[PDB]
Amino acid sequence: SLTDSVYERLLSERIIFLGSEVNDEIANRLCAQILLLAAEDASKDISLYINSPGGSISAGMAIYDTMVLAPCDIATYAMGMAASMGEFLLAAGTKGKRYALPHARILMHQPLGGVTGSAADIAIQAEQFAVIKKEMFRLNAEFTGQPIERIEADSDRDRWFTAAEALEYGFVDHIITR
Amino acid sequence: SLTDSVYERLLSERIIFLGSEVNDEIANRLCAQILLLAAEDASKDISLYINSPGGSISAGMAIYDTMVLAPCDIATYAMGMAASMGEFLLAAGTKGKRYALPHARILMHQPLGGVTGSAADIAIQAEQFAVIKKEMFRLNAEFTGQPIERIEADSDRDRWFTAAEALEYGFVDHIITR
Amino acid sequence: SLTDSVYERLLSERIIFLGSEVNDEIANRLCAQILLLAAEDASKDISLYINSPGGSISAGMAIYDTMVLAPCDIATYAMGMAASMGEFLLAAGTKGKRYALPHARILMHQPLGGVTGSAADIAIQAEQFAVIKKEMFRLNAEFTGQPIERIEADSDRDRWFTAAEALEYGFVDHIITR
Amino acid sequence: SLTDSVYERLLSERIIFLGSEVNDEIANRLCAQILLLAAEDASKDISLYINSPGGSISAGMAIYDTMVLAPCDIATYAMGMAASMGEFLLAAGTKGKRYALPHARILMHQPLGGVTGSAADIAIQAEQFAVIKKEMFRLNAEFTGQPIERIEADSDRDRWFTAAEALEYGFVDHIITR
Amino acid sequence: SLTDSVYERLLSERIIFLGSEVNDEIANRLCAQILLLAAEDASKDISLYINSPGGSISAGMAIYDTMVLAPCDIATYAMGMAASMGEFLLAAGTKGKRYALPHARILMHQPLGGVTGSAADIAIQAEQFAVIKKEMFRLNAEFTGQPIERIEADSDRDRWFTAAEALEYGFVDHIITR
Amino acid sequence: NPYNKLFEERIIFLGVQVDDASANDIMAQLLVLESLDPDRDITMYINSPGGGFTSLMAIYDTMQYVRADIQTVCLGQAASAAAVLLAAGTPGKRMALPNARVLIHQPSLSGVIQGQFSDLEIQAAEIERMRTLMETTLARHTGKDAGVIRKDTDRDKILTAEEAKDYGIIDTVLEYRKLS
Amino acid sequence: NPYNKLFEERIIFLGVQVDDASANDIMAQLLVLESLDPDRDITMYINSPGGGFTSLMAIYDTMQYVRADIQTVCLGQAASAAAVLLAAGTPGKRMALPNARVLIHQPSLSGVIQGQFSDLEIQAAEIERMRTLMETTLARHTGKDAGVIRKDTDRDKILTAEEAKDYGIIDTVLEYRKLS
Amino acid sequence: NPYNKLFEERIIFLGVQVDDASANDIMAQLLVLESLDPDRDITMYINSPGGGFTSLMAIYDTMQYVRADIQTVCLGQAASAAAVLLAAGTPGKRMALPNARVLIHQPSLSGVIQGQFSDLEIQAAEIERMRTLMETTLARHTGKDAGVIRKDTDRDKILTAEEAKDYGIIDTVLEYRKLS
Amino acid sequence: NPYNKLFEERIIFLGVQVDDASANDIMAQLLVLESLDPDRDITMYINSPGGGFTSLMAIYDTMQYVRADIQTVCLGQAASAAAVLLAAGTPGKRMALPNARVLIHQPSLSGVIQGQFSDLEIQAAEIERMRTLMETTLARHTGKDAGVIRKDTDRDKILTAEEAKDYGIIDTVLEYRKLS
Numbered sequence A, B, C, D, E: 001s002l003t004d005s006v007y008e009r010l011l012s013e014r015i016i017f018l019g020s021e022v023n024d025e026i027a028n029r030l031c032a033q034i035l036l037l038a039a040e041d042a043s044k045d046i047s048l049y050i051n052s053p054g055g056s057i058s059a060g061m062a063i064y065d066t067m068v069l070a071p072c073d074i075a076t077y078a079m080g081m082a083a084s085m086g087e088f089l090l091a092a093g094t095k096g097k098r099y100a101l102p103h104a105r106i107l108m109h110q111p112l113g114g115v116t117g118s119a120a121d122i123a124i125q126a127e128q129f130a131v132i133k134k135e136m137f138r139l140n141a142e143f144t145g146q147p148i149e150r151i152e153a154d155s156d157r158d159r160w161f162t163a164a165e166a167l168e169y170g171f172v173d174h175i176i177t178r
Numbered sequence F, G, H, I: 001n002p003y004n005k006l007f008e009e010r011i012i013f014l015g016v017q018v019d020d021a022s023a024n025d026i027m028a029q030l031l032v033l034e035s036l037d038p039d040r041d042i043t044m045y046i047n048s049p050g051g052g053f054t055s056l057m058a059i060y061d062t063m064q065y066v067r068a069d070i071q072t073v074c075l076g077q078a079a080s081a082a083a084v085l086l087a088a089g090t091p092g093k094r095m096a097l098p099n100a101r102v103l104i105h106q107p108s109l110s111g112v113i114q115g116q117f118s119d120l121e122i123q124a125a126e127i128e129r130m131r132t133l134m135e136t137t138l139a140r141h142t143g144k145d146a147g148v149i150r151k152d153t154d155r156d157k158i159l160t161a162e163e164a165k166d167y168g169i170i171d172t173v174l175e176y177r178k179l180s
């Protein structure tokens, strides 16, 4: 393809895109690209550009674990939109290397899901929703440097950020302007 | 493909097309192409031809940020239609290098969206719609050189422009005629 | 593909086909092919063969602007059918180089569209439909050499032409017969 | 593909297939193949094998015009079925070079269509249906050598032919038997 | 493709992904990759990264048998999610080489299915569901080192694990942290 | 029941899309009110979007057949076939409410009908004599030249009730009676 | 049967989406209550989401035609056409419940209608005279300048009943008879 | 017929999803029982999942309009609008069965509505005044501060009948009568 | 009419899926038979597949409210909500036919409901108190410890009528009367 050819040429320049919703297919190819780029050269930065409406928690936790366990520093770039798992992986970049492009908008909100089945199933989904929500808020409190009480309070409904508001809040470390 | 082959050969000549609605897929490949062309040669102009009915604000803000942060001058070309995000990225070109082909039509209008969910969700969507609409009008006032009061007044309903009307209004800098 | 391979080999011989409805996808690849062929050699003619039921006005205006601003002479060929935007781009060829194959049929008709939304939206769509219809009739009057009053009268309903009737009317300049 | 690879290798041997319904996509690639083969060598015959249930009149008139204006002699081959536009393009081959394989069946019938819209639209469609039906019958009378009164009488309903009946009627010139 | 190209380059580095639901298509290509990598070099470890919501028992038993009968040590990696057959194949890795990335979540639950047909069909499906459930619990008791009574008790409903809980329970052998 | 009390006071209420079943109801009602009192005027209330030509000419011929004068009153809409039925009232008794809309337009095939060209030359000759019959009917009842109506019903001709009076579709725009 | 006892006490209940069939029922009910007692006030209860312009002007003209005063009472909603019918009551008799909503907005095509540009210049001239007629009607009944209503019905203008009184849509916000 | 004998004993049965047609039936029933005996208490049985705000405030204003006291009895559910109608009964006469559920939650758009941002600033200002009116209504009838109800109806607040009594939605949890 | 003659002999027939509309019919029937003779036993025939918890507790509270004893008779099935209604009869009067099936199982969401995790912590706290209320109700009527019922309704617990008697769901398996 052409779109795959341009992404392949940026993969040679160690630039990978999270440009869709974070489902398991886009997460596995990003985890594959991070493992491929960390094996190719383990000292150069990987530039991950986020244009994402967010997606699955476990898909983004796969990316986040692959970002952390890579010996490379994953530079993240809020490119237009970093909503949900997109803001998470944005803020999951290497400290000092989390960037927002100046008109990117960062959406922060508690995870969405769905309860189904019997009341014993839903009681276990609810226990696990409380575990996921506590862990997502703990990591956003670790990324942004905000207290977990403020992360939980702001991620009650949708909490939108501009690039300057995300810089003050702690998702990104710089707003690049050239 | 053939269509991808012709676009690849114009990508070698630093000519990229915004030819669809600006969704996240077309935005990410344009952002990939602008990053690929700015890394290939950082001093030659990139010709971005707009034939677009517009699209997502955040997708077009990803393109617009990639256009601005590229060291290249992005020459934009209204090719038939620049509507919604298509007129935005048209007017987002380098000053002096925003072109309208003589029968292109430029559609300018306030952003469209959708409110959904509870009244606390919709109140936050409305605050964010007021932020997006103010920022879109601020940048169109910056691009065209019009006052933001005129941008807001003209982008109430659809506001159509010919190539000559868009030249007077400020979206394009020239109407090329050869 | 094979179909893309045969079109690629005719693109090497500077023969491009408008063979579908003129939507934005077929228009952008034709505009890409005209820009690619005018950059490859700016003095040889481009043969554009029209087998088209017509399509979008703005898509065809993108092609028409790319045909005019190309330094090449775009030779057009009515191949079976040139209806709507297909007759427009047929008649938009270089004068002296607009051809009809002897059993091509040319359909000329005012533009079709759709009004929707509120009465202030529809009043602006109607103003813009009057602008598009006046501009389409002005260019067909320029192409064919007919008065704009006759163009408007004939493009009230469908107005069909044979190759000989289109030669008398002015859409094509020759009927090639070998 | 494989199917495209076998067709590409027969295109090298100047054998093209009309093997589907004659719509604009299959017509444009046949017109592309005839233009490609006539440009490659303008003196060798092109073998067009018809296995077609017929299709669009204007699509087949595009093929028929490309067959006639090619300097090559288009040898046609009724291969199994030449119904509708398939019998037309079969009989449109070079005289002396229109072949039926011995168990091909040729279906001859007046064109099908559809009237729609207002009574002024339908009155113009009916005038154009009378033009298409007169021109299709004139060319079948030219191809077969039958009177146009017999062509119109036989193409009232479906008129089926075997290979031997099509040889007597005039669609093909030989029934090859090896 | 690009996604297939990155997976092919990790297949050269003996890194295969279980990144979807374990159906027969994903199982056969993993079994093909394990057979291909064990034939290529029979002494280097194969890294199988699990990002899976689980899937078919027999598809995962195909992978598990291919993992065991390979002379290579299959290092497994819980990457984000190892649920159902994904936790099974995670825990089916070589002892000492079953890894959880630090924010992977392991879902353990009894198999799901469906009874249908007559009461003699359903009585045989139920006998076979008791065989599959006993064998799945026997192998999870073998993998984790837990008693089969605890495996059966915990896999009554969904039983979620963090990476640290899965390390204590026995699905993984290490939590890699770099 | 308010539709019964309309019909007991000799008011046929068209109301809906003119199709077969709507035409079948009105012809049943036009002939019963013909048999109840053939010298007392039937009133026909029209709020229809039209549709149907054989359903039009079923209602049209029946309201022309009966001995009773048909008082056609347009309520909010007399479109296509219904505007022909609106003109089909007896002269002097064709009424319209002041903000009623009269929409006259040539007959149209709703949706494509397929077929051989010999089949389509007949379906086009049919809608042509549907068109001439719509214009010949509307010329008997508006006093126009039937080529004028062909020029006018070339497109959708929306008539306000005050200019459907000038066109000849109706004879009186109804004045209000609010005693106030 | 509670709808019969409304109608026996001369209360027409609008209730549903204003379409043809809803307009046909009310005009049947407006004229029967006109014939039962033309000097006794018809009450019209409005809980409608609106819709329809020819169905609007069918109900509008009929409630303006009848000798009886129309007491319009908005219950929970009068949107689009129903707010015009709410203003269509006689002055001094236009009522609304305190938490009723009045929603005035310009006419709109529900869904796209296709056609040639000559067909669409007429469908746009139609909704333009649908728009001016909606504003001329709502200016006769609210006492505004009809360019003020064009500015106000440019978008959806939700009126609370207390500010539909100030707008002129209704004349009285209904006071309760249980003080809770 | 058991719904007739409820209505003959002055019991309006809500029962279904509060939409327009359900609101139209109850207002027809609230006013007939107002006219039959305005001094005898109307009982309103509520087993509704709610829905609708203009249908809510149509039922709400009518049961506040009538001279008769409204005895609201929650049967198994008063979710969304129906819990507001449950609090809309007269004080001292708001009842609930012991295992009835009261579900109060802020207004919500069922499904996305599209539009320009100027259209959506008004649809959001509408659901904001739908939200304040839901809270101002539920503060008149529960005796809370209407900012407390905003904090409480931020999410879905399911109330058991014993803790809908403490919340002020109902006044009495109904005791059983089985001779036992 | 055989359902009328059941109801004239004070037999409420459940019969269908317990939803809102089925619950609304029975509460209308439980209170009419309460008003006809509050000292004569209402019989409730149950052939229902269950469903609904607020519809369950609407029927449950009403059959516990009325002065009349409720004779619950299970015909062929009492599943989910219907087995709770089957135990909801008065002690000594809970009957089942010999091949009737009693199916008790914990409450379940039919289909996924989406939402934020704060929305889903409440929908899970709701089905948890739906679960405890189903077990507390079924412990008052079977004489079990309500943790025993949690262990038993962990999955689908199909009870034959002879072992629904031992479980406490019913009190008597009905003997046949064929005089043959």
Ligand SMILES: CC(C)C[C@H](NC(=O)[C@H](Cc1ccccc1)NC(=O)c1cnccn1)B(O)O
Binding pocket: A022, A023, A053, A054, A055, A056, A057, A058, A083, A084, A085, A086, A088, A109, A110, A111, A112, A113, A114, A129, A132, A136
């Ligand atoms: C990511 C955090 C910040 C919040 C949001 N997360 C979610 O809504 C997503 C919803 C989703 C998205 C795509 C596919 C499947 C499920 N959360 C989850 O993946 C999820 C939901 N429930 C349990 C476990 N994980 B965001 O992605 O919309």
Ligand SMILES: CC(C)C[C@H](NC(=O)[C@H](Cc1ccccc1)NC(=O)c1cnccn1)B(O)O
Binding pocket: B053, B054, B055, B056, B057, B058, B083, B084, B085, B086, B088, B109, B110, B111, B112, B113, B114, B129, B132, B136
């Ligand atoms: C460019 C602006 C000024 C004009 C138009 N913008 C929009 O309508 C775009 C297109 C769109 C995409 C998805 C859903 C709804 C709408 N709006 C947005 O992207 C959008 C909508 N709501 C919130 C944030 N962004 B156009 O691009 O369609």
Ligand SMILES: CC(C)C[C@H](NC(=O)[C@H](Cc1ccccc1)NC(=O)c1cnccn1)B(O)O
Binding pocket: C021, C022, C023, C053, C054, C055, C056, C057, C058, C083, C084, C085, C086, C088, C109, C110, C111, C112, C113, C114, C129, C132, C136
């Ligand atoms: C060429 C003109 C004169 C006649 C016809 N034009 C149109 O109907 C086309 C409709 C169309 C066709 C294909 C895809 C999208 C839209 N015109 C337009 O594109 C159009 C319609 N309304 C406003 C602006 N442009 B023909 O192309 O079908």
Ligand SMILES: CC(C)C[C@H](NC(=O)[C@H](Cc1ccccc1)NC(=O)c1cnccn1)B(O)O
Binding pocket: D053, D054, D055, D056, D057, D058, D083, D084, D085, D086, D088, D109, D110, D111, D112, D113, D114, D129, D132, D136
């Ligand atoms: C060849 C002739 C004599 C007989 C048949 N051809 C036609 O009439 C074809 C069949 C067809 C194909 C595609 C879409 C619609 C209809 N008709 C036309 O192309 C057609 C129909 N009406 C006006 C102009 N052309 B056959 O090809 O099926």
Ligand SMILES: CC(C)C[C@H](NC(=O)[C@H](Cc1ccccc1)NC(=O)c1cnccn1)B(O)O
Binding pocket: E053, E054, E055, E056, E057, E058, E083, E084, E085, E086, E088, E109, E110, E111, E112, E113, E114, E129, E132, E136
């Ligand atoms: C893997 C074990 C631990 C638990 C779950 N297993 C299953 O549900 C899987 C997924 C599945 C596939 C097709 C049809 C039904 C179910 N079960 C089976 O493969 C399966 C096998 N035999 C009989 C019935 N189901 B998991 O994969 O969701």
Ligand SMILES: CC(C)C[C@H](NC(=O)[C@H](Cc1ccccc1)NC(=O)c1cnccn1)B(O)O
Binding pocket: F049, F050, F051, F052, F053, F054, F056, F079, F080, F081, F082, F084, F104, F105, F106, F107, F108, F109, F110, F127, F130, F134
């Ligand atoms: C003005 C008079 C003639 C009524 C007008 N006539 C029509 O356009 C109607 C619309 C219609 C209805 C049903 C099926 C197909 C088309 N024309 C016909 O009745 C019709 C029916 N069959 C063939 C041709 N025309 B109008 O559109 O109702």
Ligand SMILES: CC(C)C[C@H](NC(=O)[C@H](Cc1ccccc1)NC(=O)c1cnccn1)B(O)O
Binding pocket: G049, G050, G051, G052, G053, G054, G056, G079, G080, G081, G082, G084, G105, G106, G107, G108, G109, G110, G127, G130, G134
């Ligand atoms: C304010 C008055 C004029 C009524 C308004 N006008 C209209 O848009 C309604 C259309 C409608 C709306 C909702 C549901 C069904 C139909 N009136 C019409 O029939 C109509 C038709 N064409 C153009 C404009 N309006 B309102 O939207 O009902």
Ligand SMILES: CC(C)C[C@H](NC(=O)[C@H](Cc1ccccc1)NC(=O)c1cnccn1)B(O)O
Binding pocket: H050, H051, H052, H053, H054, H056, H079, H080, H081, H082, H084, H105, H106, H107, H108, H109, H110, H111, H127, H130, H134
């Ligand atoms: C006390 C009430 C207001 C709380 C809840 N309200 C709502 O969510 C309801 C549900 C609904 C119904 C119809 C269309 C859209 C949404 N909201 C509304 O009534 C509503 C209606 N139009 C716009 C905004 N909200 B509940 O569903 O009744």
Ligand SMILES: CC(C)C[C@H](NC(=O)[C@H](Cc1ccccc1)NC(=O)c1cnccn1)B(O)O
Binding pocket: I049, I050, I051, I052, I053, I054, I056, I079, I080, I081, I082, I084, I105, I106, I107, I108, I109, I110, I127, I130, I134
């Ligand atoms: C045993 C008692 C509590 C009833 C049981 N509960 C349920 O699962 C049914 C599920 C259902 C049935 C029909 C339509 C919608 C939902 N009852 C409920 O309404 C319900 C709703 N949410 C959670 C739990 N139960 B049973 O499944 O009917």
